[PDB]
Structures are given as C-alpha cells and as structure tokens.
Design an enzyme around this catalytic site. Structure first.
Site, mmCIF file in Angstrom:
data_model
loop_
_atom_site.group_PDB
_atom_site.id
_atom_site.type_symbol
_atom_site.label_atom_id
_atom_site.label_comp_id
_atom_site.label_asym_id
_atom_site.label_seq_id
_atom_site.Cartn_x
_atom_site.Cartn_y
_atom_site.Cartn_z
ATOM 1 N N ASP A 139 -6.982 -1.381 -7.737
ATOM 2 C CA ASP A 139 -6.694 -0.254 -6.862
ATOM 3 C C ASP A 139 -6.257 0.950 -7.698
ATOM 4 O OD1 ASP A 139 -4.321 -1.313 -7.664
ATOM 5 O OD2 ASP A 139 -3.442 -1.504 -5.664
HETATM 6 C C1 LIG Z 1 14.626 7.194 -10.842
HETATM 7 C C2 LIG Z 1 14.813 7.865 -9.484
HETATM 8 C C3 LIG Z 1 13.483 8.183 -8.805
HETATM 9 C C4 LIG Z 1 12.736 6.924 -8.372
HETATM 10 C C5 LIG Z 1 12.708 6.751 -6.855
HETATM 11 C C6 LIG Z 1 11.287 6.581 -6.327
HETATM 12 C C7 LIG Z 1 11.250 6.163 -4.859
HETATM 13 C C8 LIG Z 1 9.823 5.933 -4.369
HETATM 14 C C9 LIG Z 1 9.665 4.611 -3.623
HETATM 15 C C10 LIG Z 1 9.231 4.815 -2.174
HETATM 16 C C11 LIG Z 1 7.866 5.490 -2.070
HETATM 17 C C12 LIG Z 1 7.073 4.987 -0.866
HETATM 18 O O1 LIG Z 1 7.323 3.927 -0.403
HETATM 19 S S1 LIG Z 1 5.747 5.997 -0.149
HETATM 20 C C13 LIG Z 1 4.387 4.898 0.344
HETATM 21 C C14 LIG Z 1 3.162 5.726 0.725
HETATM 22 N N1 LIG Z 1 2.383 5.035 1.737
HETATM 23 C C15 LIG Z 1 1.018 5.452 1.998
HETATM 24 O O2 LIG Z 1 0.546 6.346 1.385
HETATM 25 C C16 LIG Z 1 0.187 4.734 3.057
HETATM 26 C C17 LIG Z 1 -1.332 4.856 2.970
HETATM 27 N N2 LIG Z 1 -1.815 4.201 1.769
HETATM 28 C C18 LIG Z 1 -2.498 4.968 0.744
HETATM 29 O O3 LIG Z 1 -2.671 6.129 0.905
HETATM 30 C C19 LIG Z 1 -3.009 4.277 -0.519
HETATM 31 O O4 LIG Z 1 -3.267 2.933 -0.226
HETATM 32 C C20 LIG Z 1 -1.996 4.352 -1.664
HETATM 33 C C21 LIG Z 1 -0.675 3.713 -1.243
HETATM 34 C C22 LIG Z 1 -1.754 5.802 -2.073
HETATM 35 C C23 LIG Z 1 -2.554 3.592 -2.863
HETATM 36 O O5 LIG Z 1 -3.725 4.233 -3.280
HETATM 37 P P1 LIG Z 1 -4.886 3.335 -4.028
HETATM 38 O O6 LIG Z 1 -4.723 1.882 -3.650
HETATM 39 O O7 LIG Z 1 -6.248 3.817 -3.593
HETATM 40 O O8 LIG Z 1 -4.757 3.480 -5.524
#
Ligand SMILES: CCCCCCCCCCCC(=O)SCCNC(=O)CCNC(=O)[C@H](O)C(C)(C)COP(=O)(O)O
Ligand SMILES: CCCCCCCCCCCCCCCCCC(=O)OC[C@H](COP(=O)([O-])OCC(O)COP(=O)([O-])OC[C@@H](COC(=O)CCCCCCCCCCCCCCCCC)OC(=O)CCCCCCCCCCCCCCCCC)OC(=O)CCCCCCCCCCCCCCCCC
Ligand SMILES: CCCCCCCCCCCCCCCCC[C@@H](O)O[C@H](CO[C@H](O)CCCCCCCCCCCCCCC)COP(=O)(O)OCC[N+](C)(C)C
Lengths: 459, 67, 80, 98, 110, 88, 178, 128, 124
Positions: free
Chosen positions: F43
């Site tokens: 992915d």
């Molecule tokens: C050190 C201090 C900073 C660190 C803190 C960081 C905190 C961040 C953690 C929380 C972030 C989240 O959960 S935000 C989660 C975001 N969720 C979505 O985007 C749902 C739809 N899914 C998609 O668009 C794709 O599947 C995708 C996921 C992009 C993958 O892409 P590929 O599969 O095509 O590579």
C-alpha cells in the site's frame, strides 16, 4: 596662481583643435599634467596664507580642494568616454568644454580673495552643471532634476548677494583679510538675525541641509556619470568652504543661532541613514549617504571648534573621493545591465571578482573603517560634539551603527547570493574601469599615510 | 596509508592510532596521579581552618559582664 | 577500492535489542519489518562499547602502573 | 499514482541528454596545453627583517627622547648595583617564626 | 582556555569531516572505538574544561571559583556561578555520551 | 580524499540490498523492474516507509512530490543518479 | 523539485505527508534505533487503525486533530539532512556554480587550452541552434488555445527531435561544480 | 485536548492549522485551477525567452518595474492631505526636533550655569 | 556561612557590620594592646615595586620569594620554602582578622545584653 588657471584656458582650444580620434587622449594627459602642477599648492605656511596677488590667495583649506578638483577632472574624462562613443565629434568636444569650464570656475572659486568675486564664480558654476545634466542625461526626469538643481540653489543665494553688498556699505570692504582683521561683534537684534540667515542659507542649501535636500537625489540620479561625480565630490564642498569663510563675521550670534540647524543636521543624519536601508535604487542610496555625511559636516562647522574644523575638512575630502568611487562602481553595473534597480543583477562576485574587491574596499571606506581619513574626520567631529554636549554621543552613535548596516547591505545585495539566471550579457571588466577604481582608491590610502595635509588651517 | 569504505562493517584501524591514543590517555592519568601524589595540598587545603567558638575570652579580651 | 557489499542474509535481529522490540510488539499483535535493516548497528564490531565511567578511565591502568613504578623509584632513590 | 507516459518519456530523454553532456565534460589526456636551499627560509624571513628592525630602532628611534621607555628594574635587599657598586643592606632581623 | 577550547573544536571538526559533513549528534553513533585518537583527545579536553585537578583548566578555574567564594560580592552572582559550573559538566557529559557511546546511528557507508 | 565517485551499479546494488531486508518483500520475487503496488502488493504507507529507508541509506532527502512518483527500484535508481549527477 | 506541482493536494497526499513528518519528528525525539522502531510501529498502528473510513468528513476531522497534536508535540529542533533547505550545507556550493555562457567570453589564449572540450561545446551549441525552431513549433502545436494549464512539458515524438525546453535543464552546472 | 497556538504578526499560522483549507468547496477548487493556470502561463512565457539561443541581454520583468515605480514615483500623485496623514507628518517631523532641542538646551544651560559658579572640574580640559 | 544566616534572619543588632567595623576602641577589653610591627621599610617596598595591594604586614616574605625566584630562574621548582613561609604568614594574618571579627561580635552581644539588663534593673 595663474600658472594653474592658464593651462585650463589652454585645454579649451587644445581640445577644440584636436583630431577627431585624439580628443580623449590629449584631454586626459594634459589634465593629469595640470593636476601634477597643482600638487605644489600643498606647501602651506603655519601663520598666514599664500597671498599670490590682489585677486587670488591660497589657504590650507582650499589647497586640498584644488588638488581634488584637478585630480577629479581626468577621472571624469575616463568615465565619460564609454557612453559617449556613438556621439558626434562636435558634441564630444562640447561635453569636454563643459567639463573644462566647470573645473576652471571651481579653481577660481576656491581662491578668490574677495567675497563678491567668490559669489560670482560660485554662482557661475551652475551653468555647465545644469547644461550637462539636462543635455546628456539618460531619462526624461533629467529636465525636472535640472530645475530642482537650479532654483533650490538660487533661492538660497540671492539674499546672500544683497547681504554681501550691504556689508560693503557698512565696513567698506569685502576682502577676506580686511574682514578678518577688522571683525566686530554682531549684536542681538532682528536685523542682525536676518543678516545671519541671509549669509547662511545659501551654504546651507548647498551642503545640503536636511529638509533642503530634495534636489540632491534628483540631480545625482538623473545626471550622467561625470555630472554625478562632479556634484558629489566637489560641488557639495562649496557650501562648507563658504560657511567656513563666512562664519568669521557672524559671531557671537551663531552661538545661539545654530540650534535649529544643529537639530536638523543631527536628526536628518539619523533619518537619511535610516532611509538608505530601504532603497530600491542604487544611486539614491549613495545620494542619501552623501546627505548624511554632509549633515555631519554641517554639525562640525556649526559648533565652531578647531577640532570640528579639522574633522570637517578631512570628512569633505574623504567623502568626495568615496562617493565618486561608489558612483563609478554603480555605473559599471548600470552600463552592463541598463537598469539601476539593485536586486536585478545579483551574485556578481562569481562573475566579476576584482570588481567585487573594488566594491568591498569602497564600502569599507564608506562606513569609516580605521585608520582611513573618513574615520579621522568623523571621530574628530564626534569628539568636538561630545565636548559641545555629552548627549550627542547617543545620536552620533546611532548613525555609526546604521551607516555600516546599509553599506554592507548594498554589498550583500549586489555581490553575494546566486547570480540571476537570465542575465547572460555580463562581460568581463575592462582595463578602463579597473584603472578608474584604482585611481579612485589609491589616493585615499596615500592620504591616510599622511593625514596632516587635509586637516585644514586649524592644524 | 590507504583505507577503503566498509559498508556496515567496523572501519579499518591502523596500529599507530591505537598506540597514540593509549599512550596519551596513559600519560594524562600518570600526570594526574603524580601531581596529586606530590601536590595534594593544592586540592585538600594546606592550613587548618580554626573554629572561632573555641577561642578563650582572655585572648580576645572582653570583660566578664561586670563593668 | 573495488569492494562489494556483504551478504544480506547474515543480518538477524536475534541476540540484539531488536529481539526485545519484536517480543514487545508481538504481545500487542504488531510486528517490526525493519529490524533486519538495523541489525548491522549491533551485529559486528559494534557489538559492545564502554560505559561513561569506563570511557573516562581509558588509560588508567598503564598510567597507574607508570605512577607506581615511578613512586617506587623515588622511594628507593632518596636513600642515597 | 506515479508517472504518466509523457513524464516517463521526457525524463528518459532528458536523462540521456544529461548523461551525454556530463560525459562531454571529461578531459582528454592532453587538455591542459600549457604554453611556453635548505635553510634559506630562515635567512630571508627572519634574519633580514630583524636586521632592518634593529637598525631602525638602534639608530633612528632611539635618537629622540622618550621613544623607548622600559620600566625600572626591581631592586631587593641584598643586590649590588651594577653602576655605582652600591650594596643594598639586609632586612630587619626576621622574627623567625619557625 | 584557548588551548583546550581550540582543541575541542578541532576534534568536533574531525568528527564532522569523517561523517560526510554531519554535525547533529543524534546521527553520531559509537565513535569510541572507531575514532580512538579523537575520542582520547576529546575526553582529555572535556576533563580539562570541567576543572579536573592538575590539568590546564584547573589552575585558573579552581582559583577563580575559590576567589569568588571568599569575597564581598553579590550572593545571586555566586549562586549563578556555581550552577553554571555544574551545567558545564552537564553539557560536556551530553557531548561525550551522545557522540562516543552506544551504537552507530550514521549512514551505513562507513 | 573524499567519498568515492558513486556509480550506477553501486546505487542499484544498495537499493536492492535495502529492499531485500524488508520483511514484506520476497527476495526472490523482487526484481529491478518490480512494481510496489502491482507486482508486490504493498500500500501507500509501505511506499512511504521504503522512501524513508532510501533517504536514511543515501543520506539525502527526497521531496514528497518527487517521492510519490517512484514505484519501482529502477525509478529510485534513476532518481538518485539524476540527483547526484551520476553518468557512468 | 523536478515534478510539476498540481492544483491542490489530495486527502491521501496530505495524510501521507503528515505520516512522513510525524515519523521523522518521532525519530528526532527517539534517538536510539530500537526505541524508534518500537514507537514507529505504534505510530503505524495508530495510522492504519482508521484506514477504512468511508465518510470523508470524519476522515478530515481526524486529520485536523492529528495536525493539531503534531504541532503541539513536534520537536523544536528536528533533524535536518545536511543539504536539505534547513541543513548546514543547504546552499554551501552555490558560490562555485558558474553558468556555461561565461565560456563564450574567454580569451582565445584561454580557449587554446582544452581544444577538444570547446569542439564538443560547439557541437552542442549547433545542435541547440538546429533544434530550437522544432521545439518551438511542437510547443505551439501541443498547447491548448487558452494557454497551458500546468507546468508539465511534453516529450519528443518525431524522428530526431529533443524534448522542448531542454537546454537549461540538461546543462545544469553541477551539484559539486568546483 | 491540547493547548492552542495563536498566530501573531511576526509568527503567522501554519498551513496545516488553517481552518479555511479543511472546509472546501468546488468554487475553491476552481479558484485553485485558475491560480495554477495563470502561474503556468507566466512560467511558459518566462521559459520561452529563457531557452532562446538568440536571446542576449536581460529579460525585462514588468513586475519589477511596477514594484519600483510604485515604491518611488507613484507616491505623491496618490497622496491626499487627510487628518491622519497631516497628524502623522507633523508628529514624526516636528516632535523629535523639538524634543532633542529641549534636551540639548537644558543640558547646555545646566553646563553653563555650573561654569559660571566655577564648579565644573574643568582641569586638563585643553582640547575642545 | 552561618554568620550570614544569623545576621539576615536572626537579630542583626548583635551582629557585626563588616563595613562599619570596629565600633569599639582598641584598648577597651584589653588592659594594653601591643602595636603591630612592620619588617620591611617603605623604601624597600617601593624599590621592589610589589603592588599597592601586596604592601601589607607580610611584604618581607614576598620580597624574599621574588628575590629567590629571580635568582633561580631556569629551575622554576626551587622556591618552595619561601612560598610556603609567605603563605603561612598570610594565613596568620587571616586568622588575626577572624579573631578581630569574633571579638567584635562577642563585644557587641555582651554590651547589648548588659545594657538591656541594666535597663531592666532600672525599670524595677
Ligand atoms: C511526535 C508528535 C507527533 C506525532 C503524532 C501523530 C498522530 C497521528 C496519528 C493519527 C492519524 C490518523 O489516525 S488519520 C487516519 C486517516 N484516515 C483516512 O484517511 C481514511 C481513508 N483511507 C485512505 O485515504 C488511505 O487508505 C490511506 C489511509 C491514506 C492510506 O493510503 P494508501 O493505502 O493508498 O497508501
Ligand atoms: C594589515 C595589513 C598589513 C599588510 C602589510 C603590507 C600591505 C600593504 C597594503 C596596502 C594597500 C594594498 C592595496 C589594497 C587594494 C588591493 C588591490 C587588489 O585588487 O589586489 C588583488 C591582488 C591579486 O589577487 P587575486 O589573485 O586577483 O585575487 C582575486 C580577487 O581579487 C580576490 O581578492 P581578495 O579576496 O584577496 O581581496 C583582496 C583583499 C585585500 O584587499 C583589501 O580589501 C584591503 C585594501 C586596503 C584596505 C581598505 C580598507 C581599510 C581602510 C583603511 C586603510 C588604511 C591604509 C593604511 C595606509 C595604506 C597606504 C597605502 O581583501 C581582503 O583581504 C580584505 C581586507 C581586510 C583588511 C583588514 C585590515 C583592516 C585595516 C587594518 C589596519 C591596516 C593598517 C595596519 C597597521 C596600522 C598601524 C599598526 O591581491 C593582492 O595584491 C594582495 C591583497 C592584500 C591586501 C592587504 C590588505 C591589508 C593592508 C592594508 C593597507 C596596508 C598599508 C601599508 C602601509 C603600512 C601600513
Ligand atoms: C525645512 C528647513 C528649512 C530651514 C529652517 C531654518 C530655521 C530658521 C529659524 C530661525 C531661528 C531663529 C529665528 C528668530 C531668533 C529667536 C527666536 C524667537 O522665536 O524666540 C524668541 C522671540 O520671541 C518671539 O518668539 C518673537 C518671534 C515671533 C514671530 C516669529 C514666528 C515664529 C513661528 C514659526 C514659523 C516658521 C519660520 C520658518 C519658516 C520656514 C526669543 O525671545 P526675544 O528675546 O524677545 O527675541 C530675541 C531677539 N531680540 C534680542 C532682538 C529681542
């Protein structure tokens, strides 16, 4: 002293009778010979001046100015011939005639023994400068610049003439020696106050004083390189020379009439130094630098102490040389790229290294690096002002911090960084420009070697 | 002296650098030990600090709350 | 000059803190797929290093031996 | 995601041209065609300047008063002055707090 | 101070030049064994800086501290000087620990 | 002197080396023309981690806009060769 | 630096960029390799926990919260590669980069040395002169009437053409010129 | 959840913390498309002359000329005497002069008055 | 430290003031006080050019140390006895200063307590 006046009047027909391709060579060689001849005026006495005749005399304040003028003429000739190549022979001869007449008028101006003849020549210097600026200037603003140059001067000088003749009807003479030996105090009255103002405002507008300086950026930007050189190096020093000559009869009124001019000079020094930091034009930066330095000179002349007088003389000489060099350096880049905007061509050190060295030396001398004569004059003026009042060290100090900034800023803007990608017409520097820069810079350090010769009669 | 890259292995070491480093560390420690053995007073102090409380009143001379 | 990369199959997370990292992530149901890439920082000649106190006392043994023999010479040289 | 065929083709051609240009930057074996004692350093860099400096200080600087001023040397009890031969007496019978 | 300060800077420059112009100590791994002479020099210089007895920094810094402690001065200045001379050893320890101890953290091309 | 003049074969060898230590990538199934998403079934996050591994290995940062486009080891090799003016 | 930018950044691109920034800053915080691996696996689990959110609004809200948390907990002094725009060797060698057209101003005595190099330079200049007109014609024919909409340039297609606007990209000075 | 970051004039708000870029409309997408279109047109115009073999000199930039002309020559024609302009001019051009005059006059009056009484400690004050 | 804590937290009225010290005359508690004698003449100290801060009652040992330092120049490790004697008599001078401080402190506290007690007796 006709041994120096006649050779210039002979330069005139020599130029007008030369072959079409030998005007520059003849003018340069004989101007250099005349400068060598004028070098002999530096043998001054310690008590009285060299009174040549009933019409001309040489002090130790005018001898360095004469040497500077006779040295500056060949530099102007060297700088002018690059952009006048397409000009016709007759017009080139007319340009050289204008330069020769300007030098002759300055030479007779700095050595007139009587005030009215000095006024006549100091006003006659207007015509060649105005003709040069208006006729051989590059852009349409030159016309307006000429007007700003002319009337700003004349409005200041017309009352002086009246005052001068009035003095002749009161004391019976305008000869400087008789005036000095027969000086009498000026009482505190309105008539004496207006006489003081009439005698002072001409040289104030020539310096120029802050608030009266709007003509200087126009004149020094719209003029050709020779015109800019002659306005910056010598023409601004006429006001200082006149003020030093004329303040002998204004005491003790000056003791309290200098306050508004001192405040204007100091605060406008700070203001112009601040202005130089935000300037999109390269010639206006040098113009406002000149304004700041001449404001310092005005302060030195107004406080009226021997140390201030020596500092003022040294500062005038050093500033003339430095500003002429800076103008030539800017004109080289302008001739390369046909634009005065400072941030157009950058990273020129990679392309023109020796010119970068010339820029560095000129900027270091501009910000008064020790032991250059610039700093000698500046430090003498600062010490005299500290004796005048202890709080001055604040304002002066502020200036000494701001000045260097903009100086280095200019350098960092023009020579450092990365080059502009689309500019590919930057030819290697000619021998002419390098020789011009060397002839500008070497006399500065040579004078640093022997500084007693530009410190005036108060030494 | 020619040394080539290793790419995830310990770099090549010549005997001379190890000898120099060991010699200089040893000479520093020897100098410290020798100087402490000969000039301990510079660290631990040389003259004893007296306690003002133990000073008798006769040598300091104050009258016994009488006059 | 003219040196090729070592074998890639010799790098193993076994016996290195990466083993502890993988065990900790296994209890959470996760995995670490980049441990073998970092195994070279612990595998070969970089396996062990001194501590801070041990680093400070680098040449203490040789220096103390020299000091002891010099002191012994001094003690039995003033006997003249 | 990734390149499009136009981008891949342009990158390919630009890479070939850039590699050709970089290869052309190499120098042929003849390219720089240039057209047509032991302790000497201590003599022309130490001895001559010190000779000049000593001459200038001994025969020109010292010819005028107060040009070179040295602080007066220390005198202790017990020394003998070089010029007058005077001997400085001893110092007041130490209490000898041995 | 001139001696050991210039020498510490030279050791830092040697470390920087060796690791392809890298200056962050977070990518500086175990150089205790990889750079023996540099490690020895830097350790000696850090000890001299911290006023280790009978080294170069001792004969000036120790006397400076003991003269400050025994003079009619501001008390806050004395406290600040003592805290500063502790923090000196603190940051020297930071440099040594992060630069020379532990496991490598630099790119694999040694 | 300084670091040796990196060549194309060295870059490709290092790329394949760092890729073969990835646990999600089969060594035998991995080729210089293998696609990350299509041929290997990874992915986008795995691609981000791979690009970060390349940055750590070669000691220079790849901008994100340029990083997204890389999909096969040959693309990474070509990008690194173009970046460092490697022509042989 | 080489690829033409797009009109806007997609949600996937924004999430990937946040993932890269968070991982790099976590590495800056976690100096040691094993600790970094452990916390990077934890961060990967956090990121892929919500990978299957069908509602874009909640996905963008999660992205917003992640950006706020990153900004609060970012390393004040993060690690930067030496030649990155924040590094200590970012523009170190720009003083050594000289454009090629300067070689047109050399004195013939200077050009006497390196004759083969200047012959090859003449070859390249003649090639550029001969291909400029075809490059211009191709750009004119391929461009939409309303002007270009992106900064992407086409490749060469005919027998022996060169990609349009190639001279100042192929003839880059160098990365380590002097 | 976490402490908030408030922007200032000299410390602006980051792009990732801008609310306006997470609530979008197709109008905003169209606007970004036009922005990229203008930028691409200008870039194409620049790159056409940048790569021209027959071009020798400086590529004149109308934006630079506009900037310099607006900064230097266009100021007075667009100046109007308003209460704000007049008040600021009077303040910044008169207040400093009179303030410094008062300061220096007071200092010099004090110095002169001390001189008249004969208590200034003017010994060794030879140079002036 | 304890003196600083006592003066800045406790009763400072019975604590000596280092700037204004002594406040008692030198022969108050002593029936007679011997005058401190100085070994080196003014001229010797001037000729040695010690310093304005080294011209205390200890200058003779310093002059001796300087003389022996100048005499044995290359052997810079030979003037240990003279240095030790100078340091010792410096230490004696310091101990005398501590004695003066402690004397002044007990004088102040005793005098203040005795004045308070006399006032209390006169108040009853
Ligand atoms: C050190 C201090 C900073 C660190 C803190 C960081 C905190 C961040 C953690 C929380 C972030 C989240 O959960 S935000 C989660 C975001 N969720 C979505 O985007 C749902 C739809 N899914 C998609 O668009 C794709 O599947 C995708 C996921 C992009 C993958 O892409 P590929 O599969 O095509 O590579
Ligand atoms: C302290 C020095 C002592 C030296 C002893 C002898 C030196 C005599 C020098 C006299 C002046 C020389 C002429 C200067 C212009 C150079 C012309 C040129 O283009 O050369 C290129 C030429 C060829 O080089 P290249 O391979 O083409 O290089 C490529 C690029 O050009 C790239 O070139 P680059 O990058 O190398 O640039 C040239 C270089 C050098 O060029 C310069 O920028 C310096 C130019 C002069 C300084 C200008 C600013 C100072 C203003 C005050 C001037 C005081 C002068 C004193 C009296 C001098 C009388 C002539 O730039 C710098 O290094 C920066 C200069 C910073 C100066 C630092 C010191 C400040 C002043 C300190 C006090 C000075 C007096 C000390 C004694 C006082 C009493 C104790 O190089 C040289 O010739 C060597 C340059 C050496 C410069 C010496 C500067 C120090 C000397 C200052 C005056 C010395 C006075 C001597 C009398 C006794 C005192
Ligand atoms: C942009 C820069 C241009 C150049 C600026 C040059 C500055 C020129 C100003 C001239 C300085 C002094 C002029 C007058 C001398 C005294 C000043 C006077 O105002 O003070 C009091 C004068 O009292 C009153 O003020 C009288 C003057 C009032 C009328 C003048 C109008 C002032 C308003 C300011 C207008 C701006 C003038 C400049 C226009 C450009 C002193 O009291 P007094 O002792 O009794 O007078 C002394 C003279 N005595 C001995 C003959 C008696």
């Amino acid at each position: 002293m006709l041994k120096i006046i006649i050779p210039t009047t002979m330069l005139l027909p020599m130029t007008w009778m030369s072959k079409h391709n030998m005007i520059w060579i003849n003018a340069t060689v004989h101007s250099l010979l005349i400068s060598l001849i004028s070098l002999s005026l530096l043998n001054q006495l310690g008590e009285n001046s060299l009174n040549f005749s009933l019409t001309f005399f040489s002090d130790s304040l005018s001898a360095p100015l004469l040497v500077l003028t006779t040295w500056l003429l060949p530099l102007m000739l060297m700088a002018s011939q690059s952009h006048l190549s397409k000009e016709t022979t007759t017009r080139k001869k007319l340009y050289i005639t204008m330069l020769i007449l300007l030098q002759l008028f300055l030479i007779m101006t700095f050595t007139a023994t009587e005030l009215i003849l000095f006024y006549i020549l100091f006003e006659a210097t207007l015509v060649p400068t105005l003709i040069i600026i208006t006729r051989w200037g590059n852009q349409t603003e030159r016309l307006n610049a000429g007007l700003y140059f002319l009337f700003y001067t004349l409005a200041g000088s017309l009352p002086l003439l009246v005052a001068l003749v009035y003095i002749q009807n009161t004391t019976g003479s305008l000869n400087f020696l008789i005036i000095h030996y027969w000086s009498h105090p000026l009482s505190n009255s309105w008539s004496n106050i207006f006489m003081w103002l009439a005698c002072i405002m001409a040289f104030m507008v020539k310096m120029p004083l802050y608030g009266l300086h709007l003509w200087l950026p126009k004149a020094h930007v719209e003029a050709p390189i020779a015109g800019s050189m002659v306005l910056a190096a010598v023409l601004l020093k006429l006001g200082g020379y006149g003020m030093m000559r004329i303040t002998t009869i204004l005491n003790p009124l000056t003791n309290y009439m200098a306050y508004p001019f001192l405040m204007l000079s100091m605060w406008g020094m700070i203001m112009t130094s601040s202005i130089c930091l935000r300037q999109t034009d390269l010639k206006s930066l040098i113009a406002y630098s000149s304004v700041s330095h001449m404001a310092l000179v005005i302060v030195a002349i107004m406080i009226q102490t021997p140390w201030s007088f020596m500092g003022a003389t040294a500062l005038m000489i050093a500033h003339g040389l430095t500003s002429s060099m800076l103008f030539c350096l800017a004109n080289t880049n302008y001739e390369r790229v046909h634009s005065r905007t400072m941030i157009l061509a950058r990273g020129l050190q990679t392309l023109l290294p020796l010119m970068a060295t010339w820029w560095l030396v000129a900027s270091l001398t501009n910000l008064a690096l020790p032991p250059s004569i610039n700093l000698i004059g500046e430090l003498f003026i600062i010490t005299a002002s500290f004796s005048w009042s202890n709080i001055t060290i604040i304002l002066m100090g502020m200036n000494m911090m701001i000045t260097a900034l903009y100086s280095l800023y200019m350098l960092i803007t023009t020579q450092r960084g990365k080059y502009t990608h689309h500019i590919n017409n930057i030819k290697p520097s000619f021998t002419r420009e390098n020789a011009l820069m060397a002839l500008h810079i070497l006399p500065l350090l040579l004078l640093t070697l022997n500084p007693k010769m530009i410190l005036g009669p108060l030494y | 002296v020619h040394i080539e890259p290793r790419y995830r292995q310990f770099p090549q070491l010549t005997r001379s650098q190890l000898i120099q480093a060991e010699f200089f560390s040893a000479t520093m420690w020897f100098w410290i030990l020798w100087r402490f053995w000969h000039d301990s007073d510079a660290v631990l102090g040389h003259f004893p600090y007296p306690d003002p409380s133990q000073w008798t009143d006769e040598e300091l001379g104050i009258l016994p709350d009488d006059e | 000059s003219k040196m090729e990369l070592p074998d890639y199959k010799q790098w193993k997370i076994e016996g290195t803190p990466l083993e502890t990292v993988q065990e900790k992530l296994a209890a959470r149901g996760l995995r670490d797929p980049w441990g073998r890439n970092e195994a070279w920082r612990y595998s070969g000649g970089f396996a062990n290093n001194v501590s801070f106190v041990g680093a400070l006392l680098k040449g203490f043994k040789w220096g103390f031996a020299a000091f002891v023999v010099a002191v012994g010479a001094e003690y039995y040289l003033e006997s003249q | 995601s990734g390149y499009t065929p136009d981008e891949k083709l342009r990158l390919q051609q630009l890479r070939e041209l850039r590699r050709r240009w970089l290869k052309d930057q190499e120098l042929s074996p003849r390219e720089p065609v240039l057209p047509p004692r032991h302790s000497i350093f201590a003599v022309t860099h130490v001895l001559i300047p010190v000779w000049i400096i000593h001459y200038y200080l001994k025969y020109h600087v010292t010819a005028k008063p107060y040009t070179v001023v040295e602080r007066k040397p220390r005198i202790f009890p017990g020394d003998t002055i070089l010029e007058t031969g005077e001997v400085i007496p001893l110092m007041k019978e130490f209490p000898d707090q041995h | 101070h001139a001696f050991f300060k210039a020498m510490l800077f030279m050791c830092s420059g040697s470390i920087i030049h060796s690791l392809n112009d890298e200056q962050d100590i977070r990518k500086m791994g175990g150089l205790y064994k990889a750079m023996p002479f540099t490690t020895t020099a830097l350790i000696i210089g850090s000890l001299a800086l911290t006023g280790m007895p009978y080294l170069t920094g001792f004969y000036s810094k120790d006397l400076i501290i003991e003269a400050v402690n025994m003079s009619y001065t501001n008390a806050w200045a004395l406290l600040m000087t003592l805290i500063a001379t502790s923090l000196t050893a603190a940051y020297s320890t930071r440099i040594i620990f992060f630069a020379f101890l532990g496991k490598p953290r630099f790119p694999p091309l040694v | 002197s300084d670091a040796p003049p990196l060549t194309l074969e060295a870059i490709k060898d290092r790329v394949l080396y760092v890729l073969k230590l990835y646990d999600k990538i089969d060594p035998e199934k991995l080729s210089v023309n293998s696609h990350f998403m299509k041929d290997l079934g990874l992915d986008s996050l795995d691609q981000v981690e791979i690009i970060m591994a390349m940055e750590d290995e070669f000691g220079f940062e790849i901008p994100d806009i340029d990083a997204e486009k890389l999909m096969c080891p040959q693309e990474i090799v070509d990008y690194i060769a173009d970046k460092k003016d490697v022509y042989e | 630096a080489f690829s033409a930018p797009a009109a806007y950044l997609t949600h996937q691109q924004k999430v990937l960029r946040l993932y890269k920034r968070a991982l790099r800053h976590l590495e800056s915080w976690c100096v040691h390799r094993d600790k970094y691996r452990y916390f990077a696996c934890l961060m990967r689990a956090r990121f892929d926990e919500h990978k299957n959110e069908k509602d874009m609004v909640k996905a963008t809200q999660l992205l917003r919260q992640a950006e706020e948390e990153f900004w609060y907990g970012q390393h004040p002094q993060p690690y930067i590669f030496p030649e990155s725009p924040g590094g200590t060797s970012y523009e170190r060698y720009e003083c050594y980069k000289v454009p090629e057209w300067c070689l047109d101003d050399w004195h013939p005595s200077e050009k006497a040395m390196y004759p083969d190099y200047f012959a090859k330079r003449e070859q390249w200049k003649r090639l550029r002169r001969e291909s400029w007109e075809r490059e211009v014609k191709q750009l004119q024919e391929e461009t939409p009437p309303g002007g270009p909409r992106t900064e992407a340039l086409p490749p060469a297609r005919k027998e022996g053409d060169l990609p349009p606007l190639w001279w100042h990209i192929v003839t880059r000075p160098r990365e380590r010129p002097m | 959840s976490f402490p908030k970051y408030k922007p200032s004039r000299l410390a602006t708000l980051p792009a990732t913390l801008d609310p306006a870029e997470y609530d979008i409309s197709p109008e905003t997408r169209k606007a970004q498309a036009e922005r990229l279109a203008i930028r691409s047109r200008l870039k194409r115009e620049y790159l056409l002359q940048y790569n021209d073999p027959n071009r020798l000199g400086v590529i004149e930039d109308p934006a630079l000329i506009r900037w310099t002309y607006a900064r230097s020559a266009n100021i007075y024609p667009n100046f109007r005497p308003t209460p704000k302009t007049s008040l600021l001019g009077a303040l910044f051009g008169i207040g400093p002069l009179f303030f410094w005059y008062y300061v220096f006059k007071t200092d010099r009056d004090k110095k002169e008055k001390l001189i008249q009484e004969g208590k200034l400690d003017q010994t060794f004050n030879i140079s002036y | 430290g304890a003196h600083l804590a006592r003066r800045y937290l406790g009763d400072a009225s019975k604590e000596p003031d280092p700037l204004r010290m002594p406040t008692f005359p030198p022969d108050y508690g002593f029936p007679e006080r011997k005058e401190r004698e100085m070994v080196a003449t003014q001229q010797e100290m001037n000729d040695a050019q010690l310093m304005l801060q080294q011209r205390d009652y200890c200058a003779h040992y310093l002059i001796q140390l300087l003389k022996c330092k100048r005499d044995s120049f290359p052997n810079f490790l030979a003037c240990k006895h003279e240095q030790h004697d100078w340091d010792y008599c410096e230490h004696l001078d310091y101990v005398k200063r501590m004695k003066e401080f402690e004397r002044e402190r007990r004088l102040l506290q005793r005098k203040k307590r005795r004045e308070q007690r006399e006032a209390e007796m006169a108040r009853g």
